[PDB]
Write a protein that binds this ligand. Structure first.
Ligand SMILES: [Zn+2]
Lengths: 173, 224
């Protein structure tokens, strides 16, 4: 859990292990054991080795690997960076409009005459005039603790693009 | 010691019925004529003179001098209970607190200390000779005293909170907190039944516009 924070296109410990298998040539021995009719007794073992080897990969993404991938992935990384930045800028501008251009201790209170409060009296609004354009009663409410039984299941791992050498080796394998 | 319920009625009788002659022997009720102005908000400070009180009850003067703060509160309560009797005009609202009180009254038609915009003071009796500062000893604690001295330090006029007015964000109700002590605890969460029974979590925002402030000034007197 400490060192699973590796960023994509980097050699994780599993990637380095697969590279060790590749350079040692045990991968070819696994192919031999899988193709051999005489040594069929080790089929379940070889299947488990291959499963743990291809643990992290996605088939279509792996099949798309090839010679010209470095330029493609570099340009894709730059474009995705700009897309993320533009989204964050848009959200920041929307929040800056939702709050006013006055500091938070700048006072002022309003009565929204049509809106009845939880009682019969008219709603008194304190969170600034800017918020009444998109007023909602849950502006200041704390969300609720989902109890342990009702907590939704979460996906067990993030996907990371492994090292390109290991991806090419796994494609060839 | 005395029954303050009866003392309040005695004070009402004095304020209603005392009279003095100012010009050509004509009779005027000097305190009724001022209660009219207080009711109309033409006058704010009422200086009641215990030399006038002495003309028909020296025992009341002794009680006031010996327990002044209690009797100051009693006189203020009596004056507030008397002003509706002397109402005969509509007030021109000039303070923003007048405007707020006007809308408070209309919404109630649709906080006594809050509705109380006047202030009452004892002008001391001449039988009480003026003391020096050194003569204001522990025996005179809680008692009306006249003291001569040199003013040597005066602060700026500051706003002293008298009645803090809050508004709730969830139920839209006003809450009031009279303040007697030199310090007080601000209110955080709404104590209204609508918020409490529903566990609404609505909190209170102080409204200086609706709260009552009074001019306050500290000074130091020094001996001659
Ligand atoms: Zn409330």
């Amino acid at each position: 859990l400490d060192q699973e924070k590796k960023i994509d296109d980097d050699a994780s410990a599993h990637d380095q292990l697969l590279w060790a298998i590749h350079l040692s040539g045990l991968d070819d021995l696994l192919l031999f054991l899988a193709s051999s009719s005489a040594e069929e007794q080790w089929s379940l073992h070889v299947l488990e080795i291959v499963s743990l080897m291809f643990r992290d990969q996605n088939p279509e993404q792996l099949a798309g690997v090839g010679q010209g991938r470095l330029a493609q992935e570099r340009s894709a990384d730059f474009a995705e960076l700009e897309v993320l930045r533009q989204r964050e800028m848009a959200e920041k501008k929307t929040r800056a409009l939702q709050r006013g251009n006055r500091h938070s201790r700048f006072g002022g209170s309003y009565i929204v005459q049509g809106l009845k409060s939880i009682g019969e009296r008219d709603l008194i609004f304190h969170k600034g005039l800017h918020n009444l354009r998109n007023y909602s009663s849950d502006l200041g409410k704390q969300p609720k603790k989902v109890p342990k039984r009702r907590q939704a299941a979460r996906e067990l791992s993030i996907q990371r693009r492994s090292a390109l050498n290991v991806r090419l080796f796994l494609r060839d394998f | 010691l005395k029954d303050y319920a009866l003392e309040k009625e005695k004070v009402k009788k004095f304020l209603q019925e005392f009279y003095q002659d100012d010009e050509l022997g004509k009779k005027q009720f000097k305190y009724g004529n001022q209660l009219v102005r207080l009711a109309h908000r033409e006058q704010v400070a009422l200086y009641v003179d215990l030399d006038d009180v002495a003309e028909d009850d020296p025992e009341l003067v002794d009680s006031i001098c010996e327990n002044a703060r209690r009797y100051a509160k009693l006189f203020a309560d009596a004056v507030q209970e008397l002003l509706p009797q002397y109402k005969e005009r509509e007030v021109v609202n000039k303070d923003v607190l007048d405007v707020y009180i006007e809308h408070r009254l209309m919404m109630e038609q649709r906080p006594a200390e809050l509705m109380r915009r006047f202030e009452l003071y004892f002008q001391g009796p001449s039988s009480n000779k003026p003391r020096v500062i050194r003569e204001v000893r522990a025996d005179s604690v809680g008692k009306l005293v006249t003291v001569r001295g040199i003013v040597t330090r005066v602060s700026e006029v500051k706003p002293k909170m008298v009645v803090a007015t809050y508004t709730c964000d969830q139920c839209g109700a006003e809450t009031y907190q009279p303040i007697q002590s030199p310090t007080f605890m601000p209110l955080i969460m709404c104590p209204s039944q609508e918020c409490q029974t529903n566990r609404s979590g609505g909190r209170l925002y102080l409204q200086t516009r609706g709260s009552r402030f009074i001019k306050f000034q500290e000074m130091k007197m020094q001996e001659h």
